[PDB]
Every structure is written in C-alpha cells, then in structure tokens.
C-alpha cells in the first residue's frame, strides 16, 4: 500500500493500556498465583503469552473471570512478567532470573525465555 | 530501574491485537457509523482516541455493547482510522484526506489531525 506510519503509535497504545491496568479500568480477569491476585486485560495477556492465547481462545475458558495458575509458579516471577507484557521492560536480576525464566517457559513467552538463557549462560 | 527493554514488544502486541480483531476474538463493542458496523476492543479504542477514552470511562456508557457515532461521520474515514489504531499505518489519500481529518478531529486523535493539516497545507 501507500500508507504512512506513526513510529511511536504502538508504544503509546501500550502505555495507555498500562494506565488502564493501573486504574483497574475494563480489566476482565484475575490471575491467581498461590496467595496472590493480579487483575489484567484478557486481550493483552493473549497478545503476550502462548499459554493465555490458548486459554482465552477455548470456548469455555474464554468466559471465566478467574484463572488459577499451577502452584509451582512464583508470584514475583509472574508480577515481573505481567509488568513486561504492559511495558516492554523486564526487571531481570540475579535473585529473580530462575523464577522469571521458569514462569516465562510456563507462559510461553519465547523472547523472555531466550534472554534468560543468554543471561544465565554468561554467568556460567 | 535496571530493566532491559525488548524493542519490538509494543509492535508485536499491536499486531496480535489486530489478529484478534480480524478473527472477532474478545471484541466487546460495535461502533455504528450510519449504515456501517465495526467490531472492536473497547481498550484499544480508548488507548487511541480521546473520544472513546471519555465514553468508556463513563459509568453508564462503559457497559454499552453498541455506540452510535454522529451522522456526519463518514464510514470510510472511520474504517481508515480504526485500521490505523490497530496497525500504526494510515491510508491517507487525496480522495479521503478531508473525511479522515474530520473523523480524527471528532475522535480526538491529535497526531492524525496534525499530519492531515500538514498534508493539506503542502497542497495549497
């Protein structure tokens, strides 16, 4: 086509989706990770995660308001990945890298799994 | 903070939101523009438009499944702007620029209004 493109549009959209999440606006699901609860938008979770994409395209699970993750999933690891979904920024640290990588593998977030593998390999 | 950032994350999220729109997945509103109907995600419309942001933060309108736009709004102009919201690409042409600019002013999409003004000024 002969379209023009606004370079900062995708980033501006993601920034506004994060502002709606912070104010709890039109969030339609709560993700339960052991004792912790995280409110989010189903569309953003699906757009970022192979696991959520599979869950919310399922004809019965698409209508659930609560999703319980596997008890082995660490709440902090999940929180870090949820923040990444909404911002593009990943808070990766020596103290959380193992939990972040395990959570990213479970959530099927291949680019996160890739950087965790590379950061771990460099420390070996 | 000491975060790392994935450059293509926002673009990848927007691409997946557009794929969900194309397959009509988790769309929660229909925008009526005269005889034409457009299905979308309320969160994406709010993230892109000052008008939709105002509408869906309203305690009564946030729950509506149908929104009727002003009869002066051109369906093609709306379609072009909806495509822009979901892709960052604007199909701006001599034959549609007046309708696109009027629709962008109504929807409160200031960056679109700005490029339309500049493209019109250059032709004068």
């Amino acid at each position: 086509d002969s379209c023009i493109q606004f370079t900062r549009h995708a980033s501006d959209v993601l920034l506004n989706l994060n502002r709606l999440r912070s104010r709890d606006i039109l969030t339609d699901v709560v993700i339960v990770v052991s004792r912790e609860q995280f409110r989010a938008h189903k569309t953003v979770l699906m757009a970022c995660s192979g696991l959520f994409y599979s869950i919310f395209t399922d004809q019965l699970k698409c209508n659930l308001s609560v999703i319980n993750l596997d008890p082995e999933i660490n709440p902090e690891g999940f929180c870090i990945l949820l923040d990444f979904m909404y911002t593009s920024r990943l808070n990766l640290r020596e103290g959380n890298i193992m939990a972040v990588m395990a959570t990213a593998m479970y959530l099927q977030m291949e680019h996160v799994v890739d950087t965790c593998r590379k950061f771990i390999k460099a420390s070996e | 903070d000491s975060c790392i950032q994935f450059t293509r994350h926002a673009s990848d999220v927007l691409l997946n939101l557009n794929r969900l729109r194309s397959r009509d997945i988790l769309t929660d509103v229909v925008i009526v523009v005269s005889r034409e109907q457009f299905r979308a995600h309320k969160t994406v419309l709010m993230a892109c438009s000052g008008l939709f942001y105002s509408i869906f933060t309203d305690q009564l309108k946030c729950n509506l499944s149908v929104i009727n736009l002003d009869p002066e709004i051109n369906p093609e102009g709306f379609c072009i702007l909806l495509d822009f919201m979901y892709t960052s690409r604007l199909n701006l042409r001599e034959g549609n620029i007046m309708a696109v600019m009027a629709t962008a002013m109504y929807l409160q999409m200031e960056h679109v209004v700005d490029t339309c003004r500049k493209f019109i000024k250059a032709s004068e």
Partner: peptide, 4 residues
C-alpha cells in the same frame, strides 16, 4: 510519521 515515516514511509514504512
């Protein structure tokens, strides 16, 4: 704005 750019030519993509």
């Amino acid at each position: 704005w750019v030519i993509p």
